[PDB]
Amino acid sequence: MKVLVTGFEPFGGEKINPTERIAKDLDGIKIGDAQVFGRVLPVVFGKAKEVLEKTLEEIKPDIAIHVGLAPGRSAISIERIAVNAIDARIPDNEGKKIEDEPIVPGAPTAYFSTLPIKKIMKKLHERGIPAYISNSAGLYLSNYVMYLSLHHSATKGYPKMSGFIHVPYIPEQIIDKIGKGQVPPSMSYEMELEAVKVPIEVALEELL
Amino acid sequence: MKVLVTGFEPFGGEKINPTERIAKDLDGIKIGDAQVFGRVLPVVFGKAKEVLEKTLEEIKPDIAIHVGLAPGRSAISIERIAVNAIDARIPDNEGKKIEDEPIVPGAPTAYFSTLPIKKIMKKLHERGIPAYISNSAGLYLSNYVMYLSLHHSATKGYPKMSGFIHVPYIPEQIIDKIGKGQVPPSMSYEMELEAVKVPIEVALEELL
Amino acid sequence: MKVLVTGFEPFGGEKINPTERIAKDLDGIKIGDAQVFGRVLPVVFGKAKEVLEKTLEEIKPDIAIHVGLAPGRSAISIERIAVNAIDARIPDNEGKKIEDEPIVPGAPTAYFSTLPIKKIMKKLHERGIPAYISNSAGLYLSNYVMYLSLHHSATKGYPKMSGFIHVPYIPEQIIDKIGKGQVPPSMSYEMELEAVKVPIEVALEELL
Amino acid sequence: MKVLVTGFEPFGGEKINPTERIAKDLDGIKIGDAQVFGRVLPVVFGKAKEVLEKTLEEIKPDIAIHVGLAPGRSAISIERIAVNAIDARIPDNEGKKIEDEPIVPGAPTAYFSTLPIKKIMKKLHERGIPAYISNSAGLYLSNYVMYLSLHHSATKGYPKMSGFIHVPYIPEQIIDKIGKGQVPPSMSYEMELEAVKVPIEVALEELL
């Protein structure tokens, strides 16, 4: 079995993206006989699709877990649904702010994630990790990647399982916000890393 | 030197109080030259006061750092002000819900914390711990203890430094709250423990 | 031209549902030459569907605006997407808590709202009414009804336009909640009523 | 009887301050036999004290209700306590940013509001207006004015009743913030105006 994990580079004026470190830390690990591949994606429309599709064809994973930063969110969230729409609340990293366009013209309006989301959530809770089901991944780069990955699955027959995990800010990202107004929630890096490993294990369990 | 650290027991139907664990962990340890004593206070009006005065008179600490749970808070908070009032939003652990009463009749309306609060915050930031200055400790058991402590100092000439640190929920407290609606912020236990050791260090440094 | 507006009965232990009162205030009114029909729906899976579909066939509206209460939301929200799923966070008004079930087996995973959502938002703004686009209607009764309505449109060819508006609590609903901590946003009833009329006006203008 | 109501000018990038309109709308009215004076204060340290102390001396009111904007707050808030401290999170309207300074060196650490805060809150509730007691007025211009007014009371014997009321944004202030992402709570201007009249009414009734 092959597992792909993706993360994103820094965006939105942030110095770091904890998911870039998660992808790098998960690259090369094994869970049983399963090999994990971790790759970092650009927060850039068009370019993220090219990198994603190249990566999928290269690796042909059985399971793809895509990870993103969700600023302001207080627990791990497991995305249920990917939507065939872009409406960027902020520009991508190249200043491209796409509004009310499909991701893939003519493709289904949405795809459900094919990860065992409820079992993933249950297992995180057992591990002491706050987690819930999210019903919108936004309409920016996280959703864009989530949708393209599920579309690839529906269209190519691989990955068999695909979904998205959003993570809170890590505490060090909060320091800079304190002298500026409201203080967003955060979660320690080590818990976020473990919260990505858990979906892989649960997914590998459920597959075959 | 002697440092008192108090925590509180569980309250409001919570299974746990992280500050109880913190007091018990810091108990008996030494930070530089100073001995640290860790005591757990009851979340009970009257009783907490008796326990607190007995503990202060017994130990005669140079520094008192009082620690409480602040549900819904997303970073470490350092209390600036203790207020001469009780207005309980919920009953204490014996079912007493005291409304509109002084803590100490005739005593001042408020006392400023005598911890070096801004230096504590600066040190917490450079250690990667999100922290801010809170201007109200509530009017339940946290503020009661914070007021009685600072009053004891002004009245008896010790501790020379006294103050209050509120901590968020730890991740494991969040798990049961997921099925039931909104999802409070949390902070790892390890980070909260370090965030109380730091106030001791900088307080010890600012004294003599 | 014929417009159906729906609201919901009280639920989740609430004494009132401001959308029940909105639907009653709009029932029988005319917007220019357009006849409006207001109907209150039960917060009951199954029964809501029977009532909705019967009402749709009875009236055959050109435009359907479905309105629901969204506790904790601070502005008017216009729903972009309906999702083919039920995952009830609380039971419905007959105690039914349905989890991870399709609304219509074999139908599209999602439908986009066919209201002119951006022109509605723009119009509300210039009317001084805070409004935004929501990308999830939840997976309870609002989404259920939103989906069934858009399904009827795609499948029967009427309504021509269909969509969903969520409203905050109205200020009176906040009174009893002030004791128990969290103080939710609200919006005056009059503004909420005006914010439902605006979609009718914009939809009518965009049709033919 | 004579009644002083103050509000503030716009600050912090905001086009309007609703408390400015409130003060101007209340000026010159009578509540029963009592005469209401409405004054707009500058959001400027030093100048606001000069203006406040001059107006208090000129009018010598029996009751002083000071009103201000609290961005982010979801209901009316009646301030319990003013504190003898300035710790400005943002500069004032003249670019001055005071950090960790007392308001009146020598004066008490805090004064309690001498408005019948609990009766005001009870009456606001019966009127369908959400309201709660706040235990911190911040440490910017609202608290500065709250403190100086109560200090004036204790020091000169007038005003006999002094206190502070904070109001949420009004809905028209929210519109430009929807692009910016997050969407703060608001309250209708009409409800906010009514909500400062009630304090005048219950305070007059309290004073003989």
UniProtKB/Swiss-Prot annotation, chains A, B, C, D:
It is found in: Cytoplasm. CDD domains: Peptidase_C15. Pfam families: Peptidase_C15 (PF01470). This is Pyrrolidone-carboxylate peptidase. GO terms for molecular function: pyroglutamyl-peptidase activity. It comes from Pyrococcus furiosus (strain ATCC 43587 / DSM 3638 / JCM 8422 / Vc1). Keywords: Cytoplasm, Disulfide bond, Hydrolase, Protease, Thiol protease. The active site is at residues 79, 142, 166. Its main location: cytoplasm. Signal peptide: none annotated. GO terms for cellular component: cytosol. Belongs to the peptidase C15 family. Homotetramer made of two disulfide-linked dimers. It catalyses: Release of an N-terminal pyroglutamyl group from a polypeptide, the second amino acid generally not being Pro. One of its GO terms (biological process) is proteolysis. It comes from the Archaea. Removes 5-oxoproline from various penultimate amino acid residues except L-proline. Its EC number is 3.4.19.3.
